[PDB]
């Protein structure tokens, strides 16, 4: 679409195997996923609320439903579910999803505005991007408590009335935490020290645009770039290669989540919303979770 800057014109096109594990109305914004490691995928359809199981076969149960939407999912040590999201009041809300479909709020924190990703950073405690505010918050599921784990504007909109999300997804990887700023279309990175507080932002990468990600264990960095219709490898090195286009399912990739087991340890997930808010000329699709084979295992998330 016309809009666009050429950001990825002249990358090289690589494209991976792929295969549409099983697909939503139109409509339907998936916006993240977590895998089981007995091979079940949970995604998060946003606008109802659902999280959603998927099995290998494509067939799909809604797992449990929350209050308001629903964004961010990641799992605990005793294999629920942390989500991020908003309330019917449109004020984020960390939940925990039990394995019985069960919901509890853990907490309500109206000094956030759209928390998005959210990623384990020790047993108890997790860290989640603030879309809005220029932070990531620290959440522990166990007290449960919330704090500022970095309010910095590398995370934070270059226009403070611009309505695109900055701080989007983040990943461990190694000593760092990498977070897509999706608004100043950037990739960063923090360092993380040994009692798990940061360092200095940097820039890793610039002109990119990346929703969610997720990391190999080589350090690839595995990008769902949405409104580019795109799936993205980004090597340590800094190179970008396009490994899916619109033609493998991808329209409006939002995230990406490898899976665990002997059967797919090396591929990873793509959910999608069709295209809803930039649709491709050939106009929306029916949202997706796209396979993507890499041929490399995942990071492990805890």
Avoid at 17 to 22: F, G, L, R, S
Avoid at 94 to 109: C, H, I, M, P
Avoid at 269 to 295: D, I, K, Q, S, W
Wanted: glycine share 8%; proline share 8%; net charge negative.
């Amino acid at each position: 679409s016309a809009g666009l800057p050429p950001i990825y014109a002249d990358k090289p096109i690589e494209l991976a195997p792929a295969k549409i594990i099983t697909s939503f109305p139109v409509n339907t914004f998936l916006e993240n996923l977590a895998s089981a490691p007995d091979g079940t995928i949970f995604v998060t359809n946003h606008e109802v609320g659902e999280i959603v199981s998927i099995t290998p076969d494509g067939n799909q149960q809604i797992h449990a439903t929350v209050e308001g939407k629903v964004s961010g999912l990641a799992f605990t040590s005793n294999g629920d579910l942390v989500a991020t999201g908003w309330n019917a009041d449109s004020i984020p809300v960390v939940s925990l999803v039990k394995s019985d479909g069960t919901v509890e709020t853990l907490l309500t924190l109206p000094d956030a505005i759209f928390l998005n990703g959210i990623t384990p950073l020790s047993d108890t405690q997790y860290l989640t991007a603030d879309s809005y505010r220029g932070a990531i918050w620290l959440i522990d599921v166990v007290q449960p408590s919330g704090s500022i784990w970095l309010e910095h504007p590398m995370l934070a909109r270059s226009n403070s009335e611009s309505v695109f999300p900055a701080a989007n997804g983040l990943k461990r990887f190694g000593n760092f935490l990498y977070v897509s700023n999706t608004e100043k279309m950037l990739l960063l990175r923090i360092p993380v020290d040994s009692t798990d507080k940061p360092g200095e932002p940097e820039i890793f990468v610039e002109q990119t645009n990346i929703d969610d990600f997720a990391f190999d264990v080589e350090g690839n960095l595995y990008g769902a770039t949405h409104i580019y219709n795109s799936v993205v490898r980004i090597a340590p090195d800094r190179s970008t290669t396009i490994i899916a286009q619109a033609e493998q399912g991808v329209i409006g990739s939002t995230a990406v989540a490898f899976g665990q087991t002997e059967g797919d340890c090396t591929a990873i997930y793509v959910v999608t919303n069709g295209g809803m808010f930039l649709p491709p000329p050939t106009g929306v699709v029916p949202a997706n979770v796209v396979r993507l084979e890499v041929g490399k295992p995942g990071y492990p998330l805890g």
